[PDB]
């Protein structure tokens, strides 16, 4: 009885199969990760477009068909990193995990979802090039060798007065600097640079304050940030976990209450009840992983890390 046609896409694979009508989110998730051979599953989730066309995370503790998925066939899901580590070097152990994060993060940088200044864009492109092409080779890598590739954000190409040959030269010089680097180490170096970007690993929600002024909430691995409507880079106010006594939710309102009782409460509003609920859930998830990564590695993790440096 496998009567529900699904398509799950990762950053570089497409899976098409059928599920039973009683299949839970977890069961669907488990089949995907088994198929692709991913073990570092804690970072990941399945995203779908609801009936209004909003991106939504599948809840793994509910049946698939009981959730606001659309009425198309096949049902369409994206398997994506949902939670980001505090440090890629310490926490992305296996090559597959590193690759999935690399491709997702790179897509966001090239699509201008994650802001990157031009110099960082160039350095990131140089590592992407090392990973794709291996060592720079003057014999082979003639002028124009990068001409096909999408290597920089359009904003960086729009806003500036270099041409595309001049952009290739910008990247080429750094490509040549990485000579001898293993392609996988280039992917790790990419992620090391990207994880320091202001927008990296931040989930933004449109909110208002108690006077009705528009702001953003960001939720990330370390806590919550409040941003000016016109600036998603520099937080107006930061709330690391350690400074939060509780968050009190009431319909569309959430109130951040400090540990410091001699500090004030901060009141904001989500545009919809469903969104406020999503804010809580993503806060709870992030905070759990925050606690977990500070505990000693599980046996499974200790073995994966051993298996990984065995492979050198």
């Amino acid at each position: 009885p496998k009567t529900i046609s699904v398509r799950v896409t990762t950053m570089d694979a497409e899976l098409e199969f059928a599920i039973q009508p009683n299949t839970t989110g977890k069961q669907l998730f488990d089949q995907v990760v088994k198929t692709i051979g991913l073990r570092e599953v804690w970072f990941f989730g399945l995203q779908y477009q609801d009936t209004k066309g909003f991106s939504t995370w599948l809840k793994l503790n509910k049946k698939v068909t009981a959730q606001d998925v659309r009425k198309e066939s096949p049902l369409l899901f994206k398997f994506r990193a949902k939670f980001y580590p505090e440090d890629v070097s310490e926490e992305l152990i296996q090559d597959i995990t590193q690759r999935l994060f690399f491709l997702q993060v790179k897509e966001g940088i090239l699509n201008d979802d994650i802001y990157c200044p031009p110099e960082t864009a160039v350095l990131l492109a140089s590592y992407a090039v090392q990973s794709k092409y291996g060592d720079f080779n003057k014999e082979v890598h003639k002028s124009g060798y990068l001409a096909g590739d999408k290597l920089l954000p359009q904003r960086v190409l729009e806003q500036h007065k270099l041409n595309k040959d001049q952009w290739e030269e910008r990247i080429q010089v750094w490509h040549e600097e990485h000579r001898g680097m293993l392609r996988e180490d280039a992917v790790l170096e990419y992620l090391k640079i990207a994880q320091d970007l202001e927008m990296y690993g931040v989930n933004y929600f449109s909110i208002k304050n108690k006077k009705g002024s528009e702001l953003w909430l960001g939720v990330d691995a370390l806590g919550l940030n409040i941003y000016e409507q016109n600036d998603r880079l520099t937080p107006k106010i930061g709330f690391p976990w350690s400074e939060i006594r509780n968050i009190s939710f009431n319909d569309k309102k959430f109130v951040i209450k400090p540990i410091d009782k001699k500090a004030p409460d901060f009141v904001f509003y989500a545009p919809r009840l469903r969104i406020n609920k999503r804010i809580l859930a993503l806060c709870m998830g992030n905070h759990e992983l925050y606690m977990r990564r500070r505990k000693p590695d599980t046996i499974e993790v200790q073995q994966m890390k051993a298996q990984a440096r065995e492979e050198k």
Partner: peptide, 13 residues
């Protein structure tokens, strides 16, 4: 299934 949590790891507390 009997998985009780919204993501792919347990929630404590």
């Amino acid at each position: 299934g009997s998985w009780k949590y919204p993501d792919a790891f347990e929630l404590s507390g």
